[PDB]
Amino acid sequence: VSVLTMFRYAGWLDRLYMLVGTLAAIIHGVALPLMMLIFGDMTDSFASVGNVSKNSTNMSEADKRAMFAKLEEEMTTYAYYYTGIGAGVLIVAYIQVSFWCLAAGRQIHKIRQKFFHAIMNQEIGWFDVHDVGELNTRLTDDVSKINEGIGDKIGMFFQAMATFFGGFIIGFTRGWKLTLVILAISPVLGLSAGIWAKILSSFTDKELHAYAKAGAVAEEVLAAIRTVIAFGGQKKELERYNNNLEEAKRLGIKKAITANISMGAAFLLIYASYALAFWYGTSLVISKEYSIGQVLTVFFSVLIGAFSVGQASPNIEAFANARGAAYEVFKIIDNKPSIDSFSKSGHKPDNIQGNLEFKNIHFSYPSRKEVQILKGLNLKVKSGQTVALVGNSGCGKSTTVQLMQRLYDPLDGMVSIDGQDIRTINVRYLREIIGVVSQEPVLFATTIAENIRYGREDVTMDEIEKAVKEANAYDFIMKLPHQFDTLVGERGAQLSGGQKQRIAIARALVRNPKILLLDEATSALDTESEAVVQAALDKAREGRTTIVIAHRLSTVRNADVIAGFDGGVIVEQGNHDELMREKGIYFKLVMTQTLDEDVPPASFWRILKLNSTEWPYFVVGIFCAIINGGLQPAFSVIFSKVVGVFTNGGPPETQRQNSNLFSLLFLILGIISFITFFLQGFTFGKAGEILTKRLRYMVFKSMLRQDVSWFDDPKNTTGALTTRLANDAAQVKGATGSRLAVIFQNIANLGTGIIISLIYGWQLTLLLLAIVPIIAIAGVVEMKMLSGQALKDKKELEGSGKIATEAIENFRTVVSLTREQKFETMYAQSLQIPYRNAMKKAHVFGITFSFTQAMMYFSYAACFRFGAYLVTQQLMTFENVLLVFSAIVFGAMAVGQVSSFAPDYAKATVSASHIIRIIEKTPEIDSYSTQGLKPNMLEGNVQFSGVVFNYPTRPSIPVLQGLSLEVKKGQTLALVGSSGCGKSTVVQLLERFYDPMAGSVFLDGKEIKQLNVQWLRAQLGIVSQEPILFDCSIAENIAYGDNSRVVSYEEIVRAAKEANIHQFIDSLPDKYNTRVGDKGTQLSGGQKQRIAIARALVRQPHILLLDEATSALDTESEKVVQEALDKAREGRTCIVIAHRLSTIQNADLIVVIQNGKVKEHGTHQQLLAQKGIYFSMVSVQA
Ligand SMILES: Nc1ncnc2c1ncn2[C@@H]1O[C@H](COP(=O)(O)OP(=O)(O)O)[C@@H](O)[C@H]1O
Ligand SMILES: Nc1ncnc2c1ncn2[C@@H]1O[C@H](COP(=O)(O)OP(=O)(O)O)[C@@H](O)[C@H]1O
């Protein structure tokens, strides 16, 4: 209905031209079966000659005279047919592609310009609706679909219907029996495709549920990565992950099995129809003059028409996607929300020293996060006053500044400019009397001259000069090469934040306004710049009424009037003295303040290198593809033999040969093709299956064996890694299938065709290869030309979009209106360049396609041309005329598949790059020894000497600078201080995750780096500051066995008892075997921390590590957990990094750490007796 009605918006010539396009489209479509009627005619005469030459056999010289004269006469008319249709189909070709560019061009240009223009004219609304910059993304995709909707695709659709319905017209008239037979296979072929779609829908959801587990198991483990290494539960998360893989491979293969059978059987019913047509076609020969070979050909083209319906379907999908995308932005495009925004027309008053008078204003933001920021306002400011706003954040100081522009229309009351209504008058004019100095001084990246020039479209370079000088912006322009003509470089790097603000002050001075609205125009600057901007602001004031917003109370001292706010309600009014004397809000504030996915080196067939390593057998698939490839010509030769025994040979046994060939056609084709196709299907099926396992196996097991700048700093999120495993293993699954797919078409065209060529006339071979290789290259060279024009188009539109997106993302473009239409001039000038490229590529796209359809007729041309003459005179044969047409169609399926597997190989290579860099390794925690798991190395005195550290992201302050520590056995090492002191970092280096940039840490003398990995996970008592459960039952969470670990009933009991989680274990029936579910994210914190403790003491370490388990908990929970801790330590090292210094007083050695530097160190009572750092930390904690 409505979807395409809006879509048209077709110009004066366009609406006419839509009809010219339709009009060429029919007659383009029609010409192909008419062209094939001539092919039937050439058959008809050859038969009228052959049946009497063979059935008389009483002359051979009469036949050489009279029979060849009719053939000669017929050939004179043939010459004027193929040339005529060719000359039509050439022109109409160019016309339908001109539809593609020229009509679309003018639509896109209209859309783009309306879009950019409607946006600047609706102000607020664009910002209200969705998020800025996502709009120019979606818009630039939309205008691409426009090319497709006003595209030649529509023309192709009409053309398709003409070959179809129009095919049946000629069919019906030359014989109506066979019409009914073709009309019946259409519902059969449609039923079969219907089972296909069913199989697809069922098997997809199945692969998805299966892979779902493999993604959930892989997701949680790789985020919990530091914890799982540390308890040594790797081999179990590996096995569980392997478990999901065994089930996923069996649904993957059944899918492949079903796909081949559905697809095999599909081709079967096509082959049956192809035979069936002949069999019922023959019945019209032997006993009737009803078919003379006309309908036999004409009905083959009706099948090509039925496939033309299949080509329609994409055309339609392009059109739907084009309308749907369009009508949704049409909504913002056409229809501004308006009547509180606009930008154009209305009355203009005269403002000389406007007042600000606020009358009973309450307002709320759209988001219902902050509702009524403003509520009840009476403020009356006389001209030549300076009003100060002090408050709290939520007073909506920003809100009053928006209402003043008339961006919103206030909920209650009105704000009256010069005591006159602000909702009656033109916005534009209103904007010009009101200067605004922004809280973000972001500007365009254009010349210093252009930035002053945005303030009024009349500033001469003198005034620019005058501007920078009073605005004390006159410094940086001189340092900068080229004075004013210095373009603001990069993304803003030629200017400080301070310098930007200075350009904005200079600009608001150039505008000469009577209201000056200063929003953090003295706040967010350094102590030096502050004075500089203040003096400039002073010089800009005292000739105008102004409102200054500042958080700096030193500048609000000297304001004429201060007005207090505590939430939106105007509380104080008076000047400095009046406020301070009463002790208002103001007096209150005085007192408070006093990619990684683009791998660079490209593969060189590393695909098949790695495939071939994990390859075990299957030489039969490719061999089966070769025979299935030569199997295709057996039909075409058989069809020659059909029409063969009908053209030449008398009436006796014509029928018999056809009956025999019918049966032969069945057994040779339908039956063997299914078998041999399923054999190839079993081969690439199992190939992708075992790749699907082994790859995901070989990545994920290698992942648990890596750490460090991808698990000690991920540069691709967990979900993106899981995505990579998905996509990759699926992609190779299709890749193996593409190998055999190329071999299939290769023997199918080139190979078997050669055999066929040897039985040609030796001239035909020569003539033929002057077509077939040429038309192949010619479609490829079209693809090349297609992408070449596309690539250059994307660059041009990128620049017009870049300058658009920069304006819309800046909310300060809406503040101005003066540079809006200036901006819309530039957008116009930029959009003219694609207009010209659209006209240039109209002839380019136009001439390529015309030349492709010119080679179709030229084939048929050389075919019938040469087929007569020297060949008709002597050595006339029924066959090799139909094989030429097959050869044309063999190049079609070769070029088509070759182009198809171009993106297949691309994505296959990319998948390979990933699998190679995983195989490339980072060889940290691969497994090492320096002991035999000796039990006389237990604890030690662990040394840290001269250790510096800074994260793999370098800008984040180096947290360890000059750190050296010591820890003696049997003693709790507290570590206290404050954040960013490398508290946590110390625990990380003792666990062996990302060891320090410089310096070293030793056990007894052997580095952590060379420490025995296995024994290290039976030497840790780690506790997270976020403990997280696994999908495993609580019993299995609590304890995890391995070949480094044991588990037992008695163990989990003692762990739960000691950890005090046993309270919670009691509740819930099945006790320990009770599963919570939902990744056990349903537990309360107290429960969680205990669960981490129970894990800790299972490992039987002599080192406990505690990560903020009293700053992630509160109350009785902290205490109970400290009790679990107290009974665990029976005289062993513990690390408490916790920031509650009130529960640290038991620690034997407290280290006060500043930025890697031990400041004070010692036992509690010493440090506490000091009035130094430590005591100050305990004082301030409480
Ligand atoms: N237009 C806005 N809508 C929503 N939040 C805003 C907006 N502008 C600023 N903010 C943020 O919300 C905070 C408080 O809201 P606001 O009503 O602007 O209080 P105030 O202007 O008095 O500081 C600001 O400090 C800022 O971080
Ligand atoms: N793997 C990491 N990569 C990047 N930054 C990290 C990583 N780990 C932690 N950080 C960040 O570095 C901060 C400071 O580190 P650290 O001094 O160890 O913290 P704290 O002393 O408060 O426990 C962390 O609080 C966090 O914001």
Author numbering: 33 to 626, 684 to 1271
From the paper:
P-glcoprotein (P-gp/ABCB1) is a member of the ATP-binding cassette (ABC) family of proteins. It operates as an ATP-dependent exporter in the plasma membrane and it exports a host of small, mostly hydrophobic, molecules from the cell. Its principal role is to protect against xenobiotic compounds entering the organism from the diet or environment. However in some cancers being treated by chemotherapy, the high mutation rate, combined with the strong selective pressure of the drug, frequently leads to up-regulation of P-gp and multi-drug resistance.
In the post-hydrolytic state the structure of the wild-type protein has been resolved at about 8 Å resolution. The current structural data implies that the ADP/vanadate state (post-hydrolytic state) can be predominantly inward-facing with the NBDs separated. The cytosolic nucleotide-binding domains (NBDs) are separated but ADP remains bound, especially at the first NBD. Two additional regions of density lie outside the NBDs in the expected positions for nucleotides. The density close to NBD1 displays higher density than that at NBD2. Densities corresponding to ADP molecules were displayed in the map. The density found close to NBD1 was significantly higher than the one at NBD2 implying that the NBD1 site may have a higher occupancy. Several reports suggest that NBD1 has a higher affinity for ATP and ADP/vanadate than its C-terminal counterpart.
